[PDB]
Amino acid sequence: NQYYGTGRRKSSAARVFIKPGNGKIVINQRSLEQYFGRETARMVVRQPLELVDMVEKLDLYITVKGGGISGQAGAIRHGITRALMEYDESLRSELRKAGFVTRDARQVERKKVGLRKARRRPQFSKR
Amino acid sequence: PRRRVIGQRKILPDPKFGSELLAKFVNILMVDGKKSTAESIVYSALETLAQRSGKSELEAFEVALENVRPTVEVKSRRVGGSTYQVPVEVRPVRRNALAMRWIVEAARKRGDKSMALRLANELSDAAENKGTAVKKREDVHRMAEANKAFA
Amino acid sequence: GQKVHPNGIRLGIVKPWNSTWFANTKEFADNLDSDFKVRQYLTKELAKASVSRIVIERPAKSIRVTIHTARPGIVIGKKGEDVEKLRKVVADIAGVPAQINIAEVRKPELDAKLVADSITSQLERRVMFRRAMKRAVQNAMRLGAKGIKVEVSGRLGGAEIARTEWYREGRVPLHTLRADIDYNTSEAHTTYGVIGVKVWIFKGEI
Amino acid sequence: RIRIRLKAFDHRLIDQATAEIVETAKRTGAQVRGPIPLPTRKERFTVLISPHVNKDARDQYEIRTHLRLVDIVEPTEKTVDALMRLDLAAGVDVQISL
Amino acid sequence: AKQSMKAREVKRVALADKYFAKRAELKAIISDVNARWNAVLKLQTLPRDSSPSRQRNRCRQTGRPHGFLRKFGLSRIKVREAAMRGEIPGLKKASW
Amino acid sequence: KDLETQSQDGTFDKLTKKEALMRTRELEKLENSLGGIKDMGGLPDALFVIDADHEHIAIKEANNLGIPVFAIVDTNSDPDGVDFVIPGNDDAIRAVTLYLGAVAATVREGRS
RNA sequence: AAGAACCUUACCUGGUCUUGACAUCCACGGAAGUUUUCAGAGAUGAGAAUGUGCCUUCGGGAACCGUGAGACAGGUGCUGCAUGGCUGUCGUCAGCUCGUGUUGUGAAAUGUUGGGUUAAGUCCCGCAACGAGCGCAACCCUUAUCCUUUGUUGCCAGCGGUCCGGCCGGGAACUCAAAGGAGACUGCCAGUGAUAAACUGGAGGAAGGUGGGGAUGACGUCAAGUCAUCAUGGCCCUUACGACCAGGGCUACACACGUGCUACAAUGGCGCAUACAAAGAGAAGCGACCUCGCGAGAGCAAGCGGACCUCAUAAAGUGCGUCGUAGUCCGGAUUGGAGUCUGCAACUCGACUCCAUGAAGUCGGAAUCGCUAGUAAUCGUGGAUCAGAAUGCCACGGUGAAUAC
């Protein structure tokens, strides 16, 4: 069986497809440790799992494309939240109420002619 | 800066403690968008302050925050050419933020080799109102007590 | 100068191109220069035709050259008395075996190019400018034209003071993307300097 | 077999050009995997709008390039032979790989 | 718009292919490290100007060397002059 | 009138609400100020004012153009602009309403 | 200027010529392989044709030159103050006006001024005003939500063959790959509101109050750049105010200024089991087999106008320890010793490796400027020359800081 989840966030999408099994997470056929996961956002991946019960409900295979690390974590969270709603909307009410399904559209703004960056113009010329 | 509103914004906390106060401390301790090393030094400082204080880490943190706490200030307006300021009780959120930034600047006032060691030592000796930022708190208090002559 | 080119933005929305073909970018330049040369050739040899424009279509080792001219008096001739000669000379100068096809256009006064060139002609023919634009606008409006606009700037009737004049009548939603617009600029050669003309037309909103 | 590729810059023109050929082969063919979107080219060409200093004043020009594929698997040779000599795409070239 | 300039450019590009692609080939044949001797150094009768690499390939509309464009072989101002007249398929105003 | 006839046949809602909002909210707003003049197509033969001083605009246009006047005057108005006078009071709204009813009745009878 | 030794080019040095540099009805011919000869920095020179495309009396020439003569200028001078095309200024500023009618002997106001208001002449109420354009609004892309056609030169859950051959039967729950439809319009309620417009919440915030970004820049002020881009207005240089061949100027340099880049360390030079980037260029081009180079790279180098064949390896980090305080293992601005592709060769002069080279600087005169959410900053990629390298310029994916009483 499968749970429907795509998880679009910050140019990152993760195919969260959960099957019965252990709560362990396999990322790129590998675990989080030898994936060298003590980098940034080292604990945020279990925050969505911190409040909900683990038991024997979640075993998923995940691939993540795009972004850095916060992009990866956001993709994981959005995909698992999208896969989570199989248990009716009773969970989704509090999932939204706690901001667990937060999707932010704060993408990059295009570079502008005349400004060397997003909002920085040349230092104002002499009076 | 005259038409906008205030939405009481909030950003990512540390999941271990899960406190908005500690969230704001760690998020203002951030520099140039640095997450791993900044949080590592934060936890190093927290564990070292717990070790040196001996009491519970969170209550020692609260005692330190109470120690650094200032009370009142004024704002410069330049009305009559002399110091003509109405002492306004600063906003509790703004008071908290100013205390945060005074602690951070007191930490910043050194140039020590190791950031973790310097941070731990200074915050630990500032936890019992005998470190670095309490002098700034006393100086701010001295800035008061005299601005009430003009109201 | 601040106003944007009118049909420039229009072309990418609703107005068809002046040519539609494909070639690799290096010989694209040669094709463009051949188009320029055939444009000059056609506008010089057919100076009496007063063609509205010429559209170039390039199939494989061929070209169509559709022509929209106001009057067919010399465009077709006496059942192919001169059209084949023009076809031959065009094929020879362009170096490719070419055919020529003919279409006709209604209401010559509704053409911006024709009215602008006509106005330049009377201004070459020692008449007052005022009557020129007034006659042009009144003739164009009465033919069902919903809105037009003319502009003349430079020397007005021999006066040496700076002159800039415009005149409009009818709807001109110029800053509306879905407005059909016809634009042109022509030139005159009066003895005291060149006289520049400009004109805008509007026909439909959708 | 014998796939057909088109390289055009007009979405409606390429859509009609690929919606004619597919039934041209489907007059007596069968199967066909189906239409595929295919990726597109993108190029932002910038040029100084002013002829005199003031580099800040520029403008952006781009050219599209769409591609369409059909991927017929098992057609009959009659219609694929009849494909040639019936070319009607004017100003746009078709690409076929042997 | 110097017509002597344009004559020089036209004649050099005319001689940029008839006098090239064979002298350079001969050099490359004799440019091998295996013994190259004084023949390559004594075969310098070439003006070294007709070679396309050392040839500007100027714009051929109004003779403005600035803004040489490989895609169109024109200058910026005339690209604006002609493209806005249409007649160049596929070119639409860009935005994103 | 052409706009309302087109609107009973035109597009209901398209993109911003402004283009269709300006179409219908102004209908009855200016329709009340227009009333039924669409049926008039001419020049009036008479006029009426409830207070001559306050609404002297109509009488001024009338005597500029030459329309006879049948107005009601009272103690605070300016009756120099009216020659065919009906003395009365501006407070008696019921009386003037019945007056309008009676004059409408005698007009609708007339000689017909 | 998206660009310099050579052309560019117009400045200099070494040396000569105007029907001209190069285009004509051309006046007669070889019918434009230019062969060998060497001198000479060089438009310096000049010398035999061995080939003979057109033909229906080579009954016309040569489209090139051989002769000085019926295509004509090579312009680097004014004039933007006569100007047409062209761009910047105020300025995404919220205004500029017009037709009917009135007050006023008349120049003119009247509509565009009063209150509520909104990003705004965006609205509403009242009044001798009613209406209408030029503008903002909207008509286009892109992304944030969901849909049907959609699977290859395939991204895989699946049964198994797997060394992790998606090859089978492949499928939708796949981001992805392009055509089209919905989504939001202040819906409907409650409040503040004159019952007007607006301002506060709720099933929506996967998007709520123009969703966020781009193009769209009204009459006009600037005698501004453009007769050197361009057609001339009144004119002009005239053995040409040109033709040329090589070496040289914008890379340099005893002046004040500005923009940009690594610096002031213990997060920088350290090595190791060492992870995820969207998104382009690619045929006077991209070049997977092996080998070594303190190196620029050196040669066999396959496949290719494309999901085929080059840069996905991303740095952002776990721990070993250091300069554990200073000119410091920080900081690497110099002159000569061997090379990578250079045109013919690198000499104000191609840029890159190995050293002798780490001077001044321990966060900064009285300060200004840019910046109210993926934003200021901190890391890493494509394009223009491409005989050749980018501190920059035109576009990208990462980690992300509040002060707006």
Swiss-Prot record, chain B:
GO MF, one example: rRNA binding
Result for mutant: residue 35 to A/E: Defective in ribosome assembly
Presence of keyword tRNA-binding: yes
Coiled coil: none
Gene Ontology cellular component list: cytoplasm; cytosol; cytosolic small ribosomal subunit; membrane; ribosome
GO biological process: cytoplasmic translation; negative regulation of translation; ribosomal small subunit assembly; translation
Result of changing residue 115 to G: Significantly decreases affinity for its own mRNA
Keywords: Ribonucleoprotein, Ribosomal protein, RNA-binding, rRNA-binding, tRNA-binding
Residues spanning the membrane: none
Something else known: The strain K12 sequence is shown.
Similarity comment: Belongs to the universal ribosomal protein uS7 family.
Subunit composition and interactions: Part of the 30S ribosomal subunit. Contacts proteins S9 and S11. Cross-links to IF3 and the P and E site tRNAs.
Protein role: One of the primary rRNA binding proteins, it binds directly to 16S rRNA where it nucleates assembly of the head domain of the 30S subunit. Is located at the subunit interface close to the decoding center, where it has been shown to contact mRNA. Has been shown to contact tRNA in both the P and E sites; it probably blocks exit of the E site tRNA. Protein S7 is also a translational repressor protein; it regulates the expression of the str operon members to different degrees by binding to its mRNA.
The protein's name in its UniProt record: Small ribosomal subunit protein uS7
Residues of the full protein shown: 2 to 152 of 179
UniProtKB/Swiss-Prot annotation, chain C:
Keywords, ordered alphabetically: Ribonucleoprotein, Ribosomal protein, RNA-binding, rRNA-binding
SUPFAM superfamilies per record: Prokaryotic type KH domain (KH-domain type II), Ribosomal protein S3 C-terminal domain
Disulfide bonds: none
GO terms assigned for molecular function: mRNA binding; rRNA binding; structural constituent of ribosome
PANTHER family in alphabetical order: 30S/40S RIBOSOMAL PROTEIN S3, SMALL RIBOSOMAL SUBUNIT PROTEIN US3C
Function: Binds the lower part of the 30S subunit head. Binds mRNA in the 70S ribosome, positioning it for translation. Plays a role in mRNA unwinding by the ribosome, possibly by forming part of a processivity clamp.
Family recorded in the similarity comment: Belongs to the universal ribosomal protein uS3 family.
Subunit structure: Part of the 30S ribosomal subunit. Forms a tight complex with proteins uS10 and uS14. With proteins uS4 and uS5 encircles the mRNA as it enters the ribosome, which may play a role in mRNA helicase processivity. Some nascent polypeptide chains are able to cross-link to this protein in situ. In collided ribosomes contacts ribosome rescue factor SmrB.
Name of the protein in question: Small ribosomal subunit protein uS3
Curated annotation (Swiss-Prot), chain E:
SUPFAM superfamilies reported in the protein's UniProt record: Glucocorticoid receptor-like (DNA-binding domain) (SSF57716)
A molecular-function term among this protein's GO annotations: structural constituent of ribosome
GO CC term, one of those recorded: cytosolic small ribosomal subunit
Gene Ontology BP annotations: cytoplasmic translation; ribosomal small subunit assembly; translation
Keywords attached to this entry: Ribonucleoprotein, Ribosomal protein
Subunit structure: Part of the 30S ribosomal subunit. Contacts proteins S3 and S10.
HAMAP family referenced in this protein's UniProt entry, alphabetically: Ribosomal_uS14_1 (MF_00537)
Similarity field: Belongs to the universal ribosomal protein uS14 family.
Protein name per its UniProtKB record: Small ribosomal subunit protein uS14
Gene: rpsN
UniProtKB/Swiss-Prot annotation, chain F:
Positions bearing N6-succinyllysine: 1
Function: Required for ribosomal protein bS1 (rpsA) to bind to the 30S subunit.
Annotated family: Belongs to the universal ribosomal protein uS2 family.
Complex and partners: Part of the 30S ribosomal subunit, contacts bS1. Some nascent polypeptide chains are able to cross-link to this protein in situ. In collided ribosomes contacts ribosome rescue factor SmrB.
Protein name: Small ribosomal subunit protein uS2
Protein species of origin: Escherichia coli (strain K12)
Gene (UniProt): rpsB
Entire-sequence positions represented here: 115 to 226 of 241
